[PDB]
From a paper:
The S glycoprotein homotrimer on the surface of SARS-CoV-2 is critical for viral entry by binding cellular receptor angiotensin-converting enzyme 2 (ACE2) and mediating fusion of viral and cell membranes. SARS-CoV-2 neutralizing antibodies bind the S glycoprotein to block its interaction with the ACE2 receptor or interfere with the pre-fusion to post-fusion conformational transition of the S glycoprotein required for membrane fusion. In this study, we characterized the previously reported F61, which was isolated from convalescent patients infected with prototype SARS-CoV-2, as a broadly neutralizing antibody against all VOCs including Omicron BA.1, BA.1.1, BA.2, BA.3 and BA.4 sublineages by utilizing antigen binding and cell infection assays. We also identified and characterized another broadly neutralizing antibody D2 with epitope distinct from that of F61.
The complexes of the WT-S bound by F61 or D2 Fab were prepared and single particle cryo-EM data were collected, resulting in the binary WT-S-F61 and WT-S-D2 structures determined at 3.62 and 3.25 Å, respectively. In the binary S-F61 and S-D2 complexes, the S trimer is in the open form with all three RBDs adopting similar upright position with a tilt angle of ~90 degree. In the S-F61 complex, each up-RBD was bound by an F61 Fab on the top RBM surface for ACE2 engagement. Among seventeen RBD residues involved in ACE2 binding, ten of them were recognized by F61, resulting in a large overlap between F61 epitope and ACE2 binding site. All six complementarity determining regions (CDRs) of F61 are involved in RBD binding, and the heavy chain is more dominant than the light chain by contributing 19 residues among all 26 antibody residues for binding. The results showed that F61 but not D2 was able to compete with ACE2 receptor in binding WT-RBD, indicating their distinct binding epitopes on the RBD. In other words, F61 and D2 epitopes are only fully exposed in the up-RBD, indicating that the down to up conformational change is a prerequisite for the binding of F61 and D2. We conclude that the tight binding and direct ACE2 competition would allow for the high potency and broad neutralization of F61 to be retained against SARS-CoV-2 VOCs including diverse Omicron sublineages.
Residue numbers in the entry:
A (entry chain F): 1 to 110
B (entry chain E): 1 to 117
C (entry chain B): 98 to 141, 153 to 176, 190 to 243, 261 to 289
D (entry chain C): 338 to 526, 529 to 577
Write the structure that this text describes.
């Protein structure tokens, strides 16, 4: 199963925009939509990005995302204590017909 | 208010047969596209199976054959049965609702399936 | 009685079974296999086209030179045959004495059975209907190939 | 063939368009040798036998799906397009042909009217369609005209930007289906003539005289075809 590459960790101080980039291929990310999911330690993940740029209802602002062709990036103006968490990126792989999820990035609000 | 309740994960030996159940409110299990996703402790999420509303079943090659699935309209429950349990199987399994293949929403707390001696 | 424009076969004249229609509008013939609803007394100076009720599902389409008299119709093995001959005779109140041979016009692949047809659509109708039957005939061909006489 | 194999295609898989083709000679050699199409998958038909086989009815379905789901328009295929939108149990020994529509999809970003039936209660029946805008509801609360957090929409458009794509980009799939009813089949498909050069065996239309051919002058009626002078022996043909 092809796995999207994710930055192992991204750490920034509060008030700094944070960008997480999901590596991808045409078979998976290039031809299909990407979404980002936020899991706090000890909780089931909650959808963070609705669809490419779009944002779901019930989601705090300062969170936005960009699909740059094969690779998709997530931008977060400011790093509040809550923002620290684990973020994952997912899309359907057409050829193997499986959702592909990256290992995740451990955001650390410093 | 949509809710997800799951139980059925327990200590088991390899090659064993075990079952899970997921309960939901405000969403009909048959009409809604449903998914089963697993997280090994401190590990990235891995997708397992999706059931389309009409009845289509898709699995993953890693969990192919060892895993099996069904959805019961009468009991409004989704069932995940796993035989040939392997070292990898240990994880927390969260039943999820998907808007087709566009995105997954309403993740559930899940139950920890543990396979060991 | 040139008023006559054509005739509908219409096996059961229902939506379930298909029906054949033929019409002469003085320029070219029209053959419709679309199923037509039952008509109590269709009528065609005078108004035209009120025999039409509903023309859903037309499988076979055809148009040819206008027929505008002895006609013969028969169906065998899904084929529809017609034969026609026109000859000028007068001073006869019945069938004129004399021998006349009928030539084939067209072969139509309708593929259905037409038990219980309906008659024509238009003055006196002056129309004769006879029934065919299995027989043996002895036919005589002249020098050029025209059937002169038979017994 | 062009009426369907070649026209501006605004057809969508959710509402595919079907055509009855009959009472015409069918030359499939032009389609097979065209090499203007990405695929020409054929199941229970042989390419040589395609012209030879005669058929009561020819039914052609025109629709547009993404390159990735061209495979789903096949027998025994499971996926959103096959189950909910267009389904072929065996295709009746039919042939599936795909032509890229990326050139047809002009402009930086046009979704046209292309839509996919993501939400349907069950799987369709062979060669069946579905055009209900009925809100899926997907919940105990009955969705009526008013929109709801669960009402959603069954039909979703496809974005077709010219750049990249390939998988997202659609190859229009036109499916052929030939059935054989009781009604006679006319759907199917000559050499130079030498007179008195030598004795030659032959087949004009249905007869095999196998005899020398010579110029005749016999009077002959128009509707007639051949002559039998004596003992049902064929002496002259036209
Ligand atoms: C038969 O054809 C010849 C052709 O010249 C003609 O002279 C003759 O009158 C024809 N016979 C009849 C009975 O019409």
């Amino acid at each position: 199963q092809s796995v999207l590459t994710q930055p192992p960790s991204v750490s920034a101080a509060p008030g700094q925009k944070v960008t997480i980039s999901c590596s991808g291929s045409s078979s998976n990310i290039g031809n299909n939509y990407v979404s980002w999911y936020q899991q706090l330690p000890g909780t089931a993940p909650k959808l963070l990005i609705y669809d490419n740029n779009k944002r779901p209802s019930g989601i705090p602002d300062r969170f936005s995302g960009s699909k740059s062709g094969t690779s998709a990036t997530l931008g977060i103006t400011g790093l509040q204590t809550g923002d620290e968490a684990d973020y994952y990126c997912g899309t359907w792989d057409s050829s193997l017909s499986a959702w592909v999820f990256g290992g995740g990035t451990k955001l650390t609000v410093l | 208010e949509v809710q997800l309740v799951e139980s059925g994960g327990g200590l088991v030996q390899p090659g064993g047969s075990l079952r899970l159940s997921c309960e939901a409110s405000e969403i009909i299990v048959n009409r809604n596209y449903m998914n089963w996703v697993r997280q090994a402790p401190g590990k990235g999420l891995e997708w397992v199976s999706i059931i389309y509303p009409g009845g289509s079943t898709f699995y993953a090659d890693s969990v192919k054959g060892r895993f099996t699935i069904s959805r019961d309209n009468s009991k409004n429950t989704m069932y995940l049965q796993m035989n040939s349990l392997r070292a990898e199987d240990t994880a927390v399994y969260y039943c999820a609702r998907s808007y087709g293949d566009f995105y997954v929403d309403f993740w559930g707390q899940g139950t920890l399936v543990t396979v060991s001696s | 009685s040139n008023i006559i424009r054509g005739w509908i076969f219409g096996t059961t004249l229902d939506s379930k079974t298909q029906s054949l229609l033929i019409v002469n509008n003085a320029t070219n013939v029209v053959i419709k296999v679309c199923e037509f609803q039952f008509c109590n007394d269709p009528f065609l100076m005078e108004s035209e086209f009120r025999v039409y009720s509903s023309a859903n599902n037309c499988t076979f389409e055809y148009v040819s030179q206008p027929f505008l008299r002895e006609f013969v119709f028969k169906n065998i093995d899904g084929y529809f045959k017609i034969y026609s001959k026109h000859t000028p005779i007068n001073l006869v109140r019945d069938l004129p004495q004399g021998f006349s041979a009928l030539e084939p016009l067209v072969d139509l692949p309708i593929g259905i059975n037409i038990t219980r047809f309906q008659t024509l659509l238009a003055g006196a109708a002056a129309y004769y209907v006879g029934y065919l039957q299995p027989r043996t005939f002895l036919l005589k061909y002249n020098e050029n190939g025209t059937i002169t006489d038979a017994v | 063939f062009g009426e369907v194999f070649n026209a501006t295609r605004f057809a969508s898989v959710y509402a595919w368009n079907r055509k009855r083709i009959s009472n015409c000679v069918a030359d499939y050699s032009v389609l097979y040798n065209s090499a203007s199409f990405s695929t020409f998958k054929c199941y229970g038909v042989s390419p040589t036998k395609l012209n030879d086989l005669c058929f009561t009815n020819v039914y052609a379905d025109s629709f547009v799906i993404r390159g990735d789901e061209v495979r789903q328009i096949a027998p025994g295929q499971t996926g959103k397009i096959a189950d909910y939108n267009y389904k072929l149990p065996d295709d009746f020994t039919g042939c599936v042909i795909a032509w890229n529509s990326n050139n047809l999809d002009s402009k930086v970003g046009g979704n046209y009217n292309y839509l996919y039936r993501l939400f349907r209660k069950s799987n369709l029946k062979p060669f069946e369609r579905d055009i209900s805008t009925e809100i899926y509801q997907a919940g105990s609360t009955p969705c009526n005209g008013v929109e709801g957090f669960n009402c959603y929409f069954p039909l979703q458009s496809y974005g077709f930007q010219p750049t990249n794509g390939v998988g997202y980009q659609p190859y229009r799939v036109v499916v052929l289906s030939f059935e054989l009813l009781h009604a006679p089949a006319t759907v199917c498909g000559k050499s130079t003539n030498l007179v008195k050069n030598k004795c030659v065996n032959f087949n004009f239309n249905g007869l095999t005289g196998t005899g020398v051919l010579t110029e005749s002058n016999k009077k002959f009626l128009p509707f007639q075809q051949f002559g039998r002078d004596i003992a049902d022996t064929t002496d002259a043909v036209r």
